[PDB]
Structure formats: structure tokens, C-alpha cells
Amino acid sequence: AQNPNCNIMIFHPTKEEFNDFDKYIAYMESQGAHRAGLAKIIPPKEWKARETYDNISEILIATPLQQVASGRAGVFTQYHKKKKAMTVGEYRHLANSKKYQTPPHQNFEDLERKYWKNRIYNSPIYGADISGSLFDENTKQWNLGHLGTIQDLLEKECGVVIEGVNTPYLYFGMWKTTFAWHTEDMDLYSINYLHLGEPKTWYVVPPEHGQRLERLARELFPGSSRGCGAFLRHKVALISPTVLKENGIPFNRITQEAGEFMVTFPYGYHAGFNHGFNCAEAINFATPRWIDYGKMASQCSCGEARVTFSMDAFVRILQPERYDLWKRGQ
Template sequence: GRYRQIYRLSTPLHSEVSRLRFTLTTVKLGNFQDRHAAAETCDTVRAFTGYLTLFDASCTVLMWLLLLQGKSVSLTNFFRIARNTMIMCFNKEPGAAEVEQEYWRIVEQRHCHVAVHYGKVDTNTHGSGFPVGKSEPFSKHGWNLTVLPNNSGSILRHLGAVPGVTIPWLNIGMVFSTSCWSRDQNRLPYIDYLHTGADCIWYSIPAEEKVKLDKVVHTLLQANGTPGLEMLEKNIMISPEVLCREGIKVHRTVQQSGQFVVCFPGTFVSKVCCGYSVSETVHFATPQWMNLGYEAAKDLKCRHIAKPFSMEKLLYQIATAESKRENGHILTTISALLKDLRNIEMRQRQELYEAGLLSSARYGTHDNSLLPGDGRKKPRKWLALESSERRCQTCQHLCYLSMVVQENENVVFCLECALRYVENHKSCRGLKMMYRYDEEQINSLVKQVCGKALGKTTEKWNGASPIKPPPKRGPRKRETVEVSLSRLSSSHLSPAAVT
């Protein structure tokens, strides 16, 4: 219907077909009986990036898939490879059910090797499949995934352009191309649109099944102490039939060209392509996601996993922007998180000071709007650090509020890891604390946010509504159609599957 026209009127996907180049990921299905045999084979491949595990239906023999980084090809050549692969595997154009049956037959019988390719393209570099020109139809439509990150209902708009988060990416696949079981590491919801090509089969496990899923995967993989969910995030594919037999709820849907699929926070998802296909994906988040995202950020820090964006930065950007708008709903949601973040930050700064770290300096460019009433002059010179230098070398945490720098070796620590470093070395020599906001500024922002959140809550209970002046008439602009994100994510973050 209406939304299919977005693709039909989209020119970038067609005009840049001959110029679009990307690096392939080759997936090879091998008959390896154990992990050691797979590892020996992997040692001979320099481009090896990981291995993919598949269970057969009886769950008695493991199948290992090698994920290899392939060569850079154009979209036209990829289409030819996909077409030839399809001809080799099927006599005629198969349906989704036929591809699914053949896919799991290959996994279960293990009589042959199958190698297919898969590509992931950053649209910020190569262009989106959606129209982006100002004069093009649907270029400002709410369902255009280049517009969705700036939707007024998505708090991710405060992050700006972040590759793989607020910048959409293209997924280019062929028959049997597989996305293994995974969930977004930040527990972010996301939306996928299939521009063109064959159907895609999606399997999903609701977030409410995570405790049971952890036990089942731990048992199946014999993880020896490693949590099952952590194992599941390491390029592992388990047959839905096996999971259902173990009592796990697995949902299945077939995505066709011109259709959207929305994945809710914490949902485990896998996907199998039924032929050549080009889809586009981007993240979004409603205010109710903040608590889940804050806990996910803590978990990633404990596991020393690099995050694509800083949760500290997101919280402070939201607090700064929404305080001006006096958005009571969002301020109420983030007030408790902001206070917790403030308490942790101040406690760690104090502990470092007591440990003997007295050298400190301000760095970076902080928001002048953090304290609207603060008229103090700011220092003219700031110590600039590249974003790549703000990642803690120990836990990979993105440092935003503060960091500790070992100036001689140009090493960065977050405050928590700096405390451990000082405890181990019994010295603060060569260390310097760099901070973006001082204690007074942080406390002032927290007080401002909590005060406005409390005021809005009081007004709500008293039934009072502030009188707003009529909006000023400005120059007429082209209308932008927005999509209410409440239609994409329930108000209580229901852990449903894909819809």
C-alpha cells in the first residue's frame, strides 16, 4: 500500500547500485565434530572473525560455521553471486517454507558444505535506500528510517549521529545468509524495513524468557560456568525446534518486501534470508527504555564490552535539553538515574582524592546551556581529547563526565578502573584527573531536573495545568509527518516478539 511507495519512489538505492561497494562476510558450513577441530581450521584463515554454531534437530552433533571476512564487491556483483547461488541450490524460485526446510536439512544432515555471503553497509557513507532529497516524495515521512531517529518521541535524537545506532545501515543478503541469535547489547528496540528482494524469516524469543533461555543454552552448550546468554551472543544459532522442545517460546514471522519488522527491547532475534535482499535498520528508544538501558550499560561495563555510545552523555544531553522544554514526563523518568549517576561520580572522585590524586584539569567542550543562570566566565583554553582516547583501556567504558589520564603513556582510565590501578601500584604518580563538569555544575543540573520533575508531578496530582502563551507564527515550512513511537513500543516495554 502506501508505505511500499517509499521504496518505489526511492532513487538512491537505484542510482548508486554500480558505485556501492562493501566488504563481504563469508559463512562456511563445515562438518566439525568439536570446537578444537574448528579452531585448528580457523588458524589457517587470516581473515577469520568468529565461528557460528548450529545444532541439529537431535542436538547430538554440533555444526560449526566459519565467519570469514571477504573481499570488497559492488552491489551489482553481489547480486550476480546471489543469483548464481540460488540457481545452484534450487531448480526454481523457492518460497520461504522451501528455503527454511532446505536450510535446516543441510544443518541436520551435514553431508555438504555451503558458503554464502552477507554484507552490512553504513548509510552515512554510501547512502540510504530511502529518499533523502528535500524535493523527493516521502523524504520527510515519519516511516522513512533516515527521519525516524529525529522523531520527537525518540530520546536517541539527543545523541546526534552515531553509526549503527541513529544512522541506519543496510543489510544485504542472499539465500541462507544468517543473522545468529542475538539481542541488542544496549537492549535498544529497532525497526527493519525490507526494501527489495526475497522474503526474510525471523525467529524471536521474548525477553521474558531470558532466565529459562539462559539455563537451556547453558545446558546445551555445556558452558562450564559461562552464562548461557553470554554464550548465545557469540555467533551461535540453535534450531527453533530444539528450543521449543526445551519449553522456550519461539515466534516466527516472514517479512516480505515493503514490510517493517519492529524488535522490542531485550528480544532475542535471528534471521535467515530466502534469497537476494536489501533491508535497512535503525534504532529508536522511548523514555521508558532509560531504566533498561542504564542497567544494560552497567552490565557491559562489568563485562568489559565496548559500547557504541555513552549512557552518561545521553543522560546529560536529555537533562540539558528537556529542562529547557520543562518536559515533566521525561524529567521524571531520568531524575532517579541522574541522581544515581551523580552519586557514583562524586563518590569515585572523592575516593581518588583521598588516595592521593590531587592533579586535575577540565577537558573537552561542555554545554554552555548546562547552567542557564551561570554567568561565570569559562576558561578560554580547553584540553581537547579525541573521542577514541576517551575509552577506558581496561573496561572499554566511554568516559564522558571524567577520566584519569596517565600522561606519560597516553593511557585513559575510567574512575573505577583508576581506583584499582592506584590500589595495585600504591601510587598516583603520572596520573591526572580530567573532568568535563565540576561538582557544583553537576549538583545544579540534578537539582534543576529533580525540581522540575517534582513540580510537574505536583501539578498532575493537583489537576493544575500551566497556561501556555499562544505559539508565534513563523514562516510556513513543509510539513513533516511523524510516527508516534507508542505504536512501535508499548508504554511498559512489553517484551513481545517481532510484529
């Protein structure tokens, strides 16, 4: 078996290998990449997402989110407080202000130490989940707005035609903006391109060990666990690498820099943070190997994890026994 220790693998496709997206995902899996839950893909030197980022300041962040923490430095939740709309230009200025800017630091490891020491004492503002794309329409390779849809994948694999659409999202980040521990909706894949700016550090648990993380989370967030059998779906819980190590949870870490893609694999729990002002684009996708994960994915039915209407058909077809209860939650 390839990659038995579940290490995060880094790939350097040639321009020829970058033509056929599905084929390259399958290639990475043939090398065991999925065992880690996360892979990095460095595009060929000839490729670009768009010509420049000089013209993006007028994008609107209609509902910036202030990420307010509670708990202890290494075990905390965050809630999102809505703020007034701002443009990307205004957001960049805010990110670079003395209150919010990245502190002096020696290297990525020093910055990581500062993040876990101090994150809870600040409330950064995140411009997350903005429907849109920054890929040029003429970019033909790895354009996240031109991938095969999950609806077409399900139809091709299972013969069922379903409603729903699948479009990318933009994320504008600043120092300390945080993504909580989660898997994707229906345990889908995700792909993530860091268009510009400062890095994003990722933590990931191998899919084969996801239940270990779930068990620890139930111990560490006992009230939340009583409220919902899939509370990690709420995307609010953080556990530091130190706490994971103390509890024997298998995980890996890596930092993504501008110009790099990250793929998360079905049932790969991940979390992380932004180093400073940046912009990422991401979308969920499926392959034939996803179907059996989608069939088995846990669901939140407590009300908290409201999601896109495109997930209706996925639950309805893949999880008919669970559908009525999940729908009540929506």
C-alpha cells in the same frame, strides 16, 4: 492485558496513521504488540520508500562477510571471514550463481526446512552493516534516516545531553545468510525495512521469556558461556526452532517480504535468515519505555562485542557502575 500469548501482530496503518512514527509505535504497544518481541507493519498502499531500485548496483560492499558455521545442524555458531570488496551488482551476480542461489522449493515452509537441514554445510556471503540509506530524502513517513535520535530521547527523558549519532545501516543478503540470536545494543528497539528482493524469515522470543533463551544458550554453548556472561552479545549462536521446541522455549516465527517493516522491541531476542538476494535497511531507536530496559541491559565486557562509540554515553549515563568494566572491554 493485551496479547497475553505474545503473538506476533501485523499492522496496516492508514496514510494518516503513518505520519507520526512515535505515536504509532505507542499505539502498537497499547495493543500488546511488544509482548511478542517483534511486529510487522505493512505500509499504506500510497506509500513508497523511493521511486525505483534501478540505480543501486554501484554501492560498494567494502567488507563482505563469509559466514562459516560449526556445530550441528540445529545448534551451531558462525564466524565471519572477511572477503574482498565488491559492488552490489557483483554481489547480486554472486548470489544468483549456482553455488549460492536459492534452491528449488515448494513454499516458505519447504525452504525453512531446507535452511535448518543444510545451512551448516554452506558458507554464504553477507553484505551486512553498511552505513547508508536507500530512502528518498523526499519520503517523509517512516524514513529510517530521519527518525528522532536515541541521544535526543535520552536527553528528553533524563535531562542529560550526550555525544553520539544514530544512522541507518544497509544489509545485502543471499540464500542462507544468517542473523544469530541477539537483542539489540542496550536492549534498544530496532526497525527494519526490506527494500527489495527475496524474503527474510524471523524467529523471536517474547521479552518476558528472554532469560529462558539465555539459560538454554548457556547449556548449549558451554565454553562460550564460561568465556562471557553475555556471550549472546557476540552475535554468533544459532538454535533451530526444533531445538527450541524440544526445550520448551517460547518463540514465534514470521516471514517478512519486500515492502514491509519489522520492529523489534526491547529485550526481544531474534534470529533469522534470508531466502535469496535482498536488501534491507535497519536502525536502532528508543522511546520512553526503553529507558528502564537500557538501565538493566546486560553487557559484554570480554572484548568480543566491540560496538559503536555512541554506546559509550548510554552505558556511562544509564549504567555507571558497569561503565569502567565495559569500557575496558572496548
